[PDB]
Amino acid sequence: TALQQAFDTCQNNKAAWLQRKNELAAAEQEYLRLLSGEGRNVSRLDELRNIIEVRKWQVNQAAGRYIRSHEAVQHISIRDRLNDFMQQHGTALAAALAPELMGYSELTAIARNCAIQRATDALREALLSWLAKGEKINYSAQDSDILTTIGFRPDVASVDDSREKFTPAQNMIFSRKSAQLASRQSV
Amino acid sequence: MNLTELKNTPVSELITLGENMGLENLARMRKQDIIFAILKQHAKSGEDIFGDGVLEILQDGFGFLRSADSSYLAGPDDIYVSPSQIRRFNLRTGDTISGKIRPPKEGERYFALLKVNEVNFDKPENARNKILFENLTPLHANSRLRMERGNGSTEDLTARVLDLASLIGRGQRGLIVAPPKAGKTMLLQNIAQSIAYNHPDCVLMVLLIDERPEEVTEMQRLVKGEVVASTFDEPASRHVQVAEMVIEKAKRLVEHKKDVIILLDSITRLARAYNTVVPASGKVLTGGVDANALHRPKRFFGAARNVEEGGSLTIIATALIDTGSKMDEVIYEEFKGTGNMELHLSRKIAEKRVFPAIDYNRSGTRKEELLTTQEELQKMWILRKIIHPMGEIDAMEFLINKLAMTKTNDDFFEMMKRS
Amino acid sequence: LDLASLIGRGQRGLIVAPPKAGKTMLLQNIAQSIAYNHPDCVLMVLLIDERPEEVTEMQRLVKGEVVASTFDEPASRHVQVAEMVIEKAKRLVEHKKDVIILLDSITRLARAYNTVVPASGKVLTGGVDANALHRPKRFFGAARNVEEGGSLTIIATALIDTGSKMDEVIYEEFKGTGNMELHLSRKIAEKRVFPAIDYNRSGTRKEELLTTQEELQKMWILRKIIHPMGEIDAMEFLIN
Ligand SMILES: Nc1ncnc2c1ncn2[C@@H]1O[C@H](COP(=O)(O)OP(=O)(O)OP(O)(O)=S)[C@@H](O)[C@H]1O
Numbered sequence: 037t038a039l040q041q042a043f044d045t046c047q048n049n050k051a052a053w054l055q056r057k058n059e060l061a062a063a064e065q066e067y068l069r070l071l072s073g074e075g076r077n078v079s080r081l082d083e084l085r086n087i088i089e090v091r092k093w094q095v096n097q098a099a100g101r102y103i104r105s106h107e108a109v110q111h112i113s114i115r116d117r118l119n120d121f122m123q124q125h126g127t128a129l130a131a132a133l134a135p136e137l138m139g140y141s142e143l144t145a146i147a148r149n150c151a152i153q154r155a156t157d158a159l160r161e162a163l164l165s166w167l168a169k170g171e172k173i174n175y176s177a178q179d180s181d182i183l184t185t186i187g188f189r190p191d192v193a194s195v196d197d198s199r200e201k202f203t204p205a206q207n208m209i210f211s212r213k214s215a216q217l218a219s220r221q222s223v
Numbered sequence: 224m225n226l227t228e229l230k231n232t233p234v235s236e237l238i239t240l241g242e243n244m245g246l247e248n249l250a251r252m253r254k255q256d257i258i259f260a261i262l263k264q265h266a267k268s269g270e271d272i273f274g275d276g277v278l279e280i281l282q283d284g285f286g287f288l289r290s291a292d293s294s295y296l297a298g299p300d301d302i303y304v305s306p307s308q309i310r311r312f313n314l315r316t317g318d319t320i321s322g323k324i325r326p327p328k329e330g331e332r333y334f335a336l337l338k339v340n341e342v343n344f345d346k347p348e349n350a351r352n353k354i355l356f357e358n359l360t361p362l363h364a365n366s367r368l369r370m371e372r373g374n375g376s377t378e379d380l381t382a383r384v385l386d387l388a389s390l391i392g393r394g395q396r397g398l399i400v401a402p403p404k405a406g407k408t409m410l411l412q413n414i415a416q417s418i419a420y421n422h423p424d425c426v427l428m429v430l431l432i433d434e435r436p437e438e439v440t441e442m443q444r445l446v447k448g449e450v451v452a453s454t455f456d457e458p459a460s461r462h463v464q465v466a467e468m469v470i471e472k473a474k475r476l477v478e479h480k481k482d483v484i485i486l487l488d489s490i491t492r493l494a495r496a497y498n499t500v501v502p503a504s505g506k507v508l509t510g511g512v513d514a515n516a517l518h519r520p521k522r523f524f525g526a527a528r529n530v531e532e533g534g535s536l537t538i539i540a541t542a543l544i545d546t547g548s549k550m551d552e553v554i555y556e557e558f559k560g561t562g563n564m565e566l567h568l569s570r571k572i573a574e575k576r577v578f579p580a581i582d583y584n585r586s587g588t589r590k591e592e593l594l595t596t597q598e599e600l601q602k603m604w605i606l607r608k609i610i611h612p613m614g615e616i617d618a619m620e621f622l623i624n625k626l627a628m629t630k631t632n633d634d635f636f637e638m639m640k641r642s
Numbered sequence: 643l644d645l646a647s648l649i650g651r652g653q654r655g656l657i658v659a660p661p662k663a664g665k666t667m668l669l670q671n672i673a674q675s676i677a678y679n680h681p682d683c684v685l686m687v688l689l690i691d692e693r694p695e696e697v698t699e700m701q702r703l704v705k706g707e708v709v710a711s712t713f714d715e716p717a718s719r720h721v722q723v724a725e726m727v728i729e730k731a732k733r734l735v736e737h738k739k740d741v742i743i744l745l746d747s748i749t750r751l752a753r754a755y756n757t758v759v760p761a762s763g764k765v766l767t768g769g770v771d772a773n774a775l776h777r778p779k780r781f782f783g784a785a786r787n788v789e790e791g792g793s794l795t796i797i798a799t800a801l802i803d804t805g806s807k808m809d810e811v812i813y814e815e816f817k818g819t820g821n822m823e824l825h826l827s828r829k830i831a832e833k834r835v836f837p838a839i840d841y842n843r844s845g846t847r848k849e850e851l852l853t854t855q856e857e858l859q860k861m862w863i864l865r866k867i868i869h870p871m872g873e874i875d876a877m878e879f880l881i882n
């Protein structure tokens with residue numbers, strides 16, 4: 037349920053990011069062509085430079101949103117897999133974790149937290165050992181296709197197009213600029 | 224089909240409606256004349272329609288009714304209000320009237336009023352008996368105006384900054400003093416949209432005088448509540464009558480136990496316009512301004528109060544500082560000390576582009592004890608203690624820095640106390 | 643607290659404060675001190691050209707009648723209420739009864755007279771008319787004690803250093819004519835008790851060779867007199 041909606045959200049965010057990418061590329065090639073041309077359109081050059089700027093900001097925003105959606109999809113998948121694996125082998129985990137997991141309800145908050153972090157560390161060495169012996173890891177069969185479509189990591193273009201950081205004052209001034217440019221293009 | 228719908232629609236709808244049913248060459252006249260002509264032609268079929276607007280009375284006993292979308296302008300769209308209506312429904316200036324209007328027969332040009340159906344958004348008959356504004360009892364601003372919007376921008380950071388630097392109360396009287404190019408207009412924006420988001424119950428009114436047309440048109444499309452604005456192109460009498468009618472309309476609204484907020488930018492411009500229009504008294508002060516001129520905008524500012532038995536009238540008016548003209552000062556110290564709160568700004572903070580530019584030490588409020596509780600009063604006092612020592616620019620940098628990572632003002636308080 | 647302790651009976655006096663110094667609640671405290679300590683005296687609280695909410699608070703937190711003029715109406719209302727309150731005070735004097743007046747503020751009344759008085763050509767530095775001077779002098783000297791029976795007395799309120807220039811001229815002429823003047827701010831205390839003008843006049847001649855007792859006349863006595871608060875010092879400028 038949640039995985040399907042998250043997957044379609046991620047795919048449409050990726051589509052929008054690609055749309056912004058090719059729009060920015062078209063604007064850039066248009067600006068370069070007019071710079072190379074003999075035509076002395078200073079006003080058009082400034083307008084195209086503004087277009088380049090606003091398209092770059094829109095691409096950054098789209099890449100950020102797509103990254104957030106990808107992370108949300110991965111988090112939801114991890115949570116669901118852990119929930120069902122726990123429903124399967126809760127007694128199996130608890131048999132090993134009993135020395136500091138029993139009496140959880142009656143333990144005080146600080147004792148609860150210290151036991152939680154101790155078990156956390158111990159399972160961390162367990163995980164690093166399992167990875168040290170090092171098989172080939174594979175997706176769960178229930179939701180393999182969604183994850184392989186999403187992929188282990190997002191596109192490198194998404195991560196390096198979001199490298200720059202804009203103060204949200206710049207973000208809102210760019211929001212006004214983008215709204216004005218969209219209205220002008222519609223006109 | 225009320226006047227409001229076709230008044231609000233853009234030029235395209237007007238020209239389309241004109242060319243659909245037989246208006247010729249309708250594209251080459253002023254919009255108020257356009258709506259007058261098209262509505263007269265449509266009403267020639269004798270179909271009574273509803274009306275809306277705010278009434279006023281001129282020197283003669285006859286009265287006019289204007290529209291809000293027309294920026295309170297006297298023109299062909301004005302609606303007759305006979306003095307018989309004034310007697311038979313105890314009418315007084317500023318009452319918003321809704322009812323059937325009368326198409327014009329021979330001998331008159333404008334549209335009259337057939338009947339009244341809604342006075343001040345209320346039934347006309349039950350409003351016959353009402354309490355006048357003069358005998359109302361003023362009271363402190365007991366209710367806090369929680370304008371912390373919590374949307375998640377540095378504009379919200381400015382909102383939180385004046386939350387931490389000012390105590391905006393329901394029904395108070397506030398003054399804002401700032402040099403030019405410091406952030407006044409969109410600080411007033413902050414106030415407007417924060418009130419709209421946090422307090423939809425109260426009505427929002429923004430009054431702008433002798434402002435540039437681009438500022439007016441960007442203000443009209445940004446605030447949720449209705450906004451009245453008259454640019455500098457119009458003469459002084461335009462601004463004067465706009466201010467009079469809007470303040471008395473707010474008076475009529477608050478007479479109905481309503482919460483009204485008026486954002487004025489500026490009050491110095493209003494004083495200058497009143498001085499220009501008022502007859503000379505022969506007792507001129509420094510700067511070419513006489514005595515009785517300042518009285519009118521000054522009672523205007525004094526109109527703000529809080530009613531004990533219901534309703535509040537808040538006025539947030541801006542005052543120009545150090546513009547190089549002596550009368551700007553004259554007004555500055557003439558209104559100084561007459562407001563329930565003062566909000567000061569410095570241009571040098573804006574020079575280094577730290578925003579907003581509110582002077583934390585200079586900004587203050589009167590009677591904070593009754594407005595808030597003791598615990599939050601002490602919680603703000605300890606911030607005053609810790610932020611008073613360093614400089615105001617350093618104070619703002621420190622505040623915005625350690626407030627950026629904090630979601631709300633409360634969490635900011637409990638994050639400071641542990642330090 | 644008690645007016646007899648501070649203002650006594652029959653003699654005038656002033657209190658002068660800067661903006662943001664605690665005027666309203668101090669006047670409140672004086673009002674209830676008069677009400678409890680001397681209920682026989684007729685209370686009279688008066689306000690000129692200030693916020694209506696404080697007018698309502700004053701008239702609601704006291705027992706005596708509070709004729710006040712808010713800051714909305716022009717100064718003609720202020721001037722005419724001034725004559726009518728002074729006339730009713732004179733009538734109460736003829737009524738053989740003591741009265742106490744809490745007026746706020748005399749600087750407001752004085753510069754209202756200044757901005758309302760007709761031009762007479764006797765203006766001074768800052769455009770201060772002479773009529774707008776001795777009409778306030780008449781009003782302020784009408785507060786003399788009643789020697790036949792009873793005693794009228796008023797407590798005055800004045801504002802200082804309000805960022806303007808009109809107020810300090812009337813302040814210094816009140817200093818010239820003041821009976822007693824309570825002070826709150828820092829500098830004006832030394833300005834009054836140790837006149838900078840007199841200090842500069844003396845220093846122009848340096849240590850003036852005042853012969854015999856003329857040098858010894860200038861004396862300063864600090865007596866830690868017993869006070870209910872506990873050892874409040876009193877400093878007196880003894881002259882010959
Ligand atoms: N919180 C803020 N967010 C974004 N920009 C701000 C902020 N505060 C100040 N500024 C900048 O401050 C500059 C001036 O702001 P204005 O509101 O136009 O000044 P002003 O006080 O209204 O004086 P006027 O209207 O020009 S006479 C603008 O370029 C804004 O970008």
Ligand SMILES: [Mg+2]
Nearest residue numbers: 406407408409
């Ligand atoms: Mg502005």
